[PDB]
Design a protein around this nucleic acid. Structure first.
Ligand SMILES: [Mg+2]
Ligand SMILES: [Mg+2]
Ligand SMILES: [Mg+2]
Ligand SMILES: [Mg+2]
Ligand SMILES: [Mg+2]
Ligand SMILES: [Mg+2]
Ligand SMILES: [Mg+2]
Ligand SMILES: [Mg+2]
Ligand SMILES: [Mg+2]
Ligand SMILES: [Mg+2]
Ligand SMILES: [Mg+2]
Ligand SMILES: [Mg+2]
Ligand SMILES: [Mg+2]
Ligand SMILES: [Mg+2]
Ligand SMILES: [Mg+2]
Ligand SMILES: [Mg+2]
Ligand SMILES: [Mg+2]
Ligand SMILES: [Mg+2]
Ligand SMILES: [Mg+2]
Ligand SMILES: [Mg+2]
Ligand SMILES: [Mg+2]
Ligand SMILES: [Mg+2]
Ligand SMILES: [Mg+2]
Ligand SMILES: [Mg+2]
Ligand SMILES: [Mg+2]
Ligand SMILES: [Mg+2]
Ligand SMILES: [Mg+2]
Ligand SMILES: [Mg+2]
Ligand SMILES: [Mg+2]
Ligand SMILES: [Mg+2]
Ligand SMILES: [Mg+2]
Ligand SMILES: [Mg+2]
Ligand SMILES: [Mg+2]
Ligand SMILES: [Mg+2]
Ligand SMILES: [Mg+2]
Ligand SMILES: [Mg+2]
Ligand SMILES: [Mg+2]
Ligand SMILES: [Mg+2]
Ligand SMILES: [Mg+2]
Ligand SMILES: [Mg+2]
Ligand SMILES: [Mg+2]
Ligand SMILES: [Mg+2]
Ligand SMILES: [Mg+2]
Lengths: 150, 145, 129
RNA sequence: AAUCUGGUCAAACUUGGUCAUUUAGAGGAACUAAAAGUCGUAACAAGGUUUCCGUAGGUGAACCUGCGGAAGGAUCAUUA
RNA sequence: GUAGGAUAGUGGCCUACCAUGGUUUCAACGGGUAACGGGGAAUAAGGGUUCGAUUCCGGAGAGGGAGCCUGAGAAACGGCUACCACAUCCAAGGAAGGCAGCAGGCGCGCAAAUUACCCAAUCCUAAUUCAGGGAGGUAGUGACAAUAAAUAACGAUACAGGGCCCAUUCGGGUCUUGUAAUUGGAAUGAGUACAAUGUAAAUACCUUAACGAGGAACAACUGGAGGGCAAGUCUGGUGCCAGCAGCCGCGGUAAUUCCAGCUCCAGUAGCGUAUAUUAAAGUUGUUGCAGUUAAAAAGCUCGUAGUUGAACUUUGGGUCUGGUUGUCCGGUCGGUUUUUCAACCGGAUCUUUCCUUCUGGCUAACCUGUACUCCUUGUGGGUGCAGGCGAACCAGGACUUUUACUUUGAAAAAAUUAGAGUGUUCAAAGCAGGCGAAAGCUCGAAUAUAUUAGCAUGGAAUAAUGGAAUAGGACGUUUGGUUCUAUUUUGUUGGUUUCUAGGACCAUCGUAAUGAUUAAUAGGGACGGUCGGGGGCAUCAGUAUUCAAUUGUCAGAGGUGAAAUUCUUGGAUUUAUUGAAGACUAACUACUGCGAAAGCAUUUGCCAAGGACGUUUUCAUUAAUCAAGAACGAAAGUUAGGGGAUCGAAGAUGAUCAGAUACCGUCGUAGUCUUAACCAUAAACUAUGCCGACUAGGGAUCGGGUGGUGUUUUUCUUAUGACCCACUCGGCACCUUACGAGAAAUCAAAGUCUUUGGGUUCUGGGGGGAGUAUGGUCGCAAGGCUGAAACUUAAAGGAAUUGACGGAA
């Protein structure tokens, strides 16, 4: 019921019944893949790409039409970033928080938030390590965090 | 509610530890462990102790019932500690006399007071090798002085 | 987290029974759960039950007969060494005569009597009396 | 064979050092018991300044009084 | 580690040289043990808890510590050598010692036996039938513990209870029971005692002759006699005494509780007391407790270990075939063998299905058909061997995803425990016994437990683990290769290269359905519009108070709790404009909103973050809670800076009361407020841990989001906005019954708990002593975290009920 806050909501995407294609909504799988690749090249993250596909074009999910997801496709092509997207975002957030703290020494809530973010990042990092995406003996923290980010 | 204690199939050591920890709230258990009887408790965690009658002392009783309870200040032989032993039945204190050896027993309450006699923990049983009850009865006689 | 899905289901069923409902809706719907349900049916504690295919995990509906009294689930799946089975039964079930102690084992998810017959016990799941 | 040169095992001793457990111990400062001591009446009734809590400071003793908090409050109440 | 040395040998066992390891919150290390380990013991529903010096197995030790001889085996102590500690013998020069063997003594202590008899048994040692044996047995003492049970029995007569032939009143009493120092016959062994038994010799037992029972004995004690708890409102003595009393309590001139008699109870050769301990104690809780208020939820969030963790991969049907008890008759000489039937447990298979696969041995078998027939008209039946079904077994590869779980098995010394058999006279026991001609024969000395770990095998549910996503993947008629290795024959050695058969490793060709489960009303992250008294930094208001300035007006204004003090008049106050300062941020303001809590309400801005939502977005187990540690954290206090208006601990001071440094009163340093450091506590309280699920109605209410030809805005249709209504998800919130609960107040959770088990953390175990002592540790301190015991005490609490009461209404 949420990781960090005490807010237990279900703001959530439903997903339709048919694993098979929504008949009429046409195009091609290959075309979709190409589009995704292009997006990746441009700079759009997998989620972003998916959103784009949903909004203007007739795509519902890549999982449906291609068979494969988006991240997987990117990997196959050679386009998934070194740091996975969510993790990267988290890191960025942490960095921002750190910066804010530096700017304004006296700020307790902010500090707490930063700490929380860091913890989250650590968790994520650990998970990644367990999986085998990010190589082991590697902490994504604070001083080098900035460097990692940019 | 899962109710406090871990119900996992591999949560056994933790449970044991918890139990152990709890054990130190139970008083008897604690006593058994630390050797409070062996380190204190005038007697050496024993049933009885022979002791020398230092003097006859009438002690004033607690409350409700009001009386003087004909106790004896006894010095235990083995340790050297000084205690106060109540002396049972009518008279009895006369029989006990003064400077006699006196075999004490616990009063009943695993230490502690015995009803109304405040600061008193022991029955005199034998005086100089007889038995107080017996003396009272006059079934057996005293071995002179 | 949603720990012991089966347990949750059982609890729900119990609640329904207490209420006086004629049927229950169950979310997660496992293999184990299904097995349990089947066992119950065999015994004679439950009507129809139907697995909805949410194109996903599962979702069961159970027809209650009004016969169930408790449909319990013991917590960690304790390792039962055949002789201990009797003890377990004594602990859980009312009467030597009737009721069951649904326990998974090598052979399959079965009641206690069945296990005895087989000559094969294992880890407990639940009970029905 | 005594005797004997180097080792080695090393008791013990001497004088120190150290940890544990005991144990004298002038004085101190406590607590407990007991039925009838002394000065208060703190709390309990809005207990006659409502109680507490934290915290400072004071006092002969309860205790007082700041500050913040709590009602186990002496109010589940004032509509427009 | 390497090498040596040593040792019977392995080995940092020791030496040399080098390396820097090794163990640890899955509690290393240290400390304690009134700890030798285990078999086992006590208790005894199940789970347990405590004890185990002690008859068996191990291990240690011989006053302590050391060293060694001899020897197969000792670091022996009924061997030696030393030193320490203790001690003996002495002619003082010197000698000898070691009971934790047995006996015995002291000593200590609450606490434990004879300086006895013997090798007959049991076994042991040697040069060994033969000796020895305080090992061992035999008695002695012995109320440790355990078993078995005497302490009158039957009469008669004599006085009363009960059946009654009949009850005109009786009564015989024809029938049966209890009471009397009557009395009488019949035993008895406890004692004694010839004998004989036993026995190494004795005792004692069992066996006997003889004597030995009549209340005076051949004599039962202990505790109790209000309750708990079986049994005295008996009598006297006592009179808060003396005493009993585990606890409750009894005692104060009417004691059923003290002290005596009688009665009487309980247990009985035992019964009491003391301490432990087990049960009872679900008052240590895994089974199986509590934490809103009774003791108990860390103030809050973070968080490593730990503990746990959504669903998804082989399901279903047939076809035979082994049993195993009920049935159908006993088909039978109370027992047995099939069928009509059954459920139940297997086995083989076939179902898109491999159970590990082959290199070979044995291919049992016929899938066979080579001659076709011993022969009822036959597919009833088998002498029979080239192709060849291999499961009928081996004996070797190849390499196993690995566990946990459970199965049966093999091992868990005997004694113990459970337990079968059996006349120790019975039993506690014991391993004995039992039957003949009673010339010889003959049953026994079982079985089961112990679940920790290891071994063995079957099972594949549950739970984990693993694999093909740069496929460096799988196979194989690949076709090249590369590195091999290498034995077998070329006479036998040393080659070199082959044919070849087995490794291994890069190519390329083919084969296949070629390879990712879901995407948890789990979680993270992007996106979208939003929301907010959420935080930081920055400004704006009200101001409001105060001092001061200038301004005006001449007796008081402040203050009062009823009342007073207290201040100015050379207008203080009051009236009016300002200024400075640092405060705060009303009204708005609610059963309203946000924040992890603490906490947060004027302005705008800036700075990031956040929940809810919406989402056909994306990752795929990242998840839940947490001892180590971390982040915050009201107020006060603190150090150090700014200010200080008022209130305002300290202090002055004015009343009141027996008094009152207390309220009330007036004043008012520290602060209060702020800024830089700390501190880390609260009735940080919802006195309610978190996550999860489910159970009963209702309206609202905040924040999102849907639909309404709804209404109004009105700039004509509008389109935003703002409502109305319905549903929707979301946090700070009523009524009834509770069947759910709860001791009850109450609770829709404090429910789904003796019908006890969703996942976790933490806390509590009568009250006090005490949040103390001590040590740690943390601090500038104040204090914080951590945290005792001795000793004490029968209640401390909670909730409510009726009262009584209240300067409450
Ligand atoms: Mg949720
Ligand atoms: Mg968390
Ligand atoms: Mg009295
Ligand atoms: Mg030397
Ligand atoms: Mg008042
Ligand atoms: Mg008072
Ligand atoms: Mg008061
Ligand atoms: Mg004062
Ligand atoms: Mg070596
Ligand atoms: Mg022991
Ligand atoms: Mg010892
Ligand atoms: Mg032992
Ligand atoms: Mg000892
Ligand atoms: Mg031994
Ligand atoms: Mg000795
Ligand atoms: Mg020795
Ligand atoms: Mg000796
Ligand atoms: Mg010896
Ligand atoms: Mg001896
Ligand atoms: Mg004795
Ligand atoms: Mg002996
Ligand atoms: Mg004797
Ligand atoms: Mg007899
Ligand atoms: Mg008597
Ligand atoms: Mg008595
Ligand atoms: Mg009496
Ligand atoms: Mg009675
Ligand atoms: Mg009387
Ligand atoms: Mg107990
Ligand atoms: Mg309790
Ligand atoms: Mg409490
Ligand atoms: Mg609390
Ligand atoms: Mg606290
Ligand atoms: Mg699962
Ligand atoms: Mg037995
Ligand atoms: Mg002033
Ligand atoms: Mg609001
Ligand atoms: Mg305002
Ligand atoms: Mg902590
Ligand atoms: Mg402050
Ligand atoms: Mg004042
Ligand atoms: Mg005064
Ligand atoms: Mg206590």
């Amino acid at each position: 019921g949420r990781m960090h806050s005490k807010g237990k909501g279900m703001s959530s995407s439903a997903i339709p019944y048919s694993r098979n294609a929504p008949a009429w909504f046409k195009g091609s799988s290959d075309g979709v893949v190409e589009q995704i690749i292009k997006y990746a090249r441009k700079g759009l993250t997998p989620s972003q790409i998916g959103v784009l596909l949903r909004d203007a074009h007739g795509v519902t999910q890549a999982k449906v039409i291609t068979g494969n997801k988006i991240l997987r496709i990117l990997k196959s092509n050679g386009l998934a970033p070194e740091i996975p997207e969510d993790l990267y975002f988290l890191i960025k957030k942490a960095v921002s928080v750190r910066k804010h703290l530096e700017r304004n020494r006296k700020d307790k809530d902010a500090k707490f938030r930063l700490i929380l973010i860091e913890s989250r990042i650590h968790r994520l990092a650990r998970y990644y390590r367990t999986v085998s995406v990010l190589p082991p003996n590697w902490k994504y923290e604070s001083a080098t965090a900035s460097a990692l980010v940019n | 509610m899962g109710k406090g204690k871990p119900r996992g199939l591999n949560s056994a050591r933790k449970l044991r530890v918890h139990r152990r920890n709890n054990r130190w709230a139970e008083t008897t258990y604690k006593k058994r462990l630390l050797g409070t009887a062996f380190k204190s408790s005038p007697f050496g965690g024993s049933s009885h102790a022979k002791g020398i009658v230092l003097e006859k002392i009438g002690i004033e009783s607690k409350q409700p019932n009001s009386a003087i309870r004909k106790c004896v200040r006894v010095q235990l032989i083995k340790n050297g500690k000084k205690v106060t032993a109540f002396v049972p039945n009518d008279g009895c204190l006369n029989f006990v006399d003064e400077n006699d050896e006196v075999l004490l027993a616990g009063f009943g309450r695993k230490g502690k007071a015995k009803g109304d006699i405040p600061g008193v923990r022991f029955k005199v049983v034998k005086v100089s090798g007889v038995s107080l009850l017996a003396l009272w009865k006059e079934k057996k006689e005293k071995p002179r002085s | 987290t949603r720990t012991s899905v089966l347990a949750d289901a059982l609890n729900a069923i119990n609640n329904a029974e207490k209420t006086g409902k004629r049927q229950v809706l169950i979310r997660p719907s496992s293999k184990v759960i299904i097995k349990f349900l089947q066992v119950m049916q065999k015994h004679g504690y439950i009507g129809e039950f139907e697995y909805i295919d949410d194109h996903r995990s599962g979702k069961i509906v159970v027809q209650l007969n009004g016969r169930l009294n408790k449909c319990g689930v013991i917590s960690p799946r304790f390792n039962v060494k055949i002789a201990d089975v009797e003890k377990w039964t004594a602990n859980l079930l009312p009467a030597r005569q009737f009721g069951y102690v649904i326990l998974t084992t090598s052979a399959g998810i079965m009641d206690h009597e069945e296990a005895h017959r087989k000559h094969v016990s294992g880890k407990i799941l639940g009970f029905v009396y």
